[PDB]
Amino acid sequence: VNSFSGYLKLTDNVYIKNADIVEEAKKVKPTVVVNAANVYLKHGGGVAGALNKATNNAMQVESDDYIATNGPLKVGGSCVLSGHNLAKHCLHVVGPNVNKGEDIQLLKSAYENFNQHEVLLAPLLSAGIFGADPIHSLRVCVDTVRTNVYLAVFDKNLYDKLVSSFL
Numbered sequence: 001v002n003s004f005s006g007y008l009k010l011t012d013n014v015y016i017k018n019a020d021i022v023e024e025a026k027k028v029k030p031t032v033v034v035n036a037a038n039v040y041l042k043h044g045g046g047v048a049g050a051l052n053k054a055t056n057n058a059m060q061v062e063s064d065d066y067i068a069t070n071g072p073l074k075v076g077g078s079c080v081l082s083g084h085n086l087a088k089h090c091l092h093v094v095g096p097n098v099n100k101g102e103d104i105q106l107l108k109s110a111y112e113n114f115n116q117h118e119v120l121l122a123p124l125l126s127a128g129i130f131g132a133d134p135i136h137s138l139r140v141c142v143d144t145v146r147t148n149v150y151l152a153v154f155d156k157n158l159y160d161k162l163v164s165s166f167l
């Protein structure tokens with residue numbers, strides 16, 4: 001039994017809510033919040049910009065040090081950094097950005113990173129401003145992640161569409 005409230009059960013291990021992941025993080029303080037990152041950990045907009053803003057830019061400062069030491073991530077890859085005031089840890093996961101011309105088949109690899117953590121609060125990878133089909137992303141999530149995932153989808157119309165079309 002955990003502290004997530006109001007989530008709609010989709011499968012054995014996947015749940016969903018119409019909420020801002022940032023506000024969910026401030027309320028639950030989960031062990032792991034997932035960031036929808038890019039390979040440079042440049043947190044300008046989307047989920048990343050919103051999370052980073054909520055940390056008063058501390059996420060970006062930490063991320064710049066990480067990149068200076070380790071270089072960029074891979075598309076489909078991840079790294080674990082601090083969750084700052086929002087969670088114990090932040091798992092920065094790079095889904096492919098179709099609007100940048102990145103390869104859609106890498107979305108499954110991106111979701112595989114979730115399996116290294118027992119419970120996660122997460123956004124819908126590669127959707128929104130990342131340009132991929134959100135129905136496809138939810139499908140890949142449910143078919144790839146085996147650990148317990150609490151998905152927050154900010155857009156109300158999209159949330160309703162995702163629930164109503166889910167198989």
Ligand SMILES: NC(=O)c1c[nH]c2ncnc(NN3C(=O)CC[C@H]3c3cccs3)c12
Binds near residue numbers: 045125126130152
């Ligand atoms: N400014 C924002 O994008 C958000 C701020 N809080 C959020 N909490 C949940 N989801 C959000 N965005 N996203 C969707 O609505 C579906 C896809 C997902 C995205 C993932 C990567 C880029 S956008 C946001």
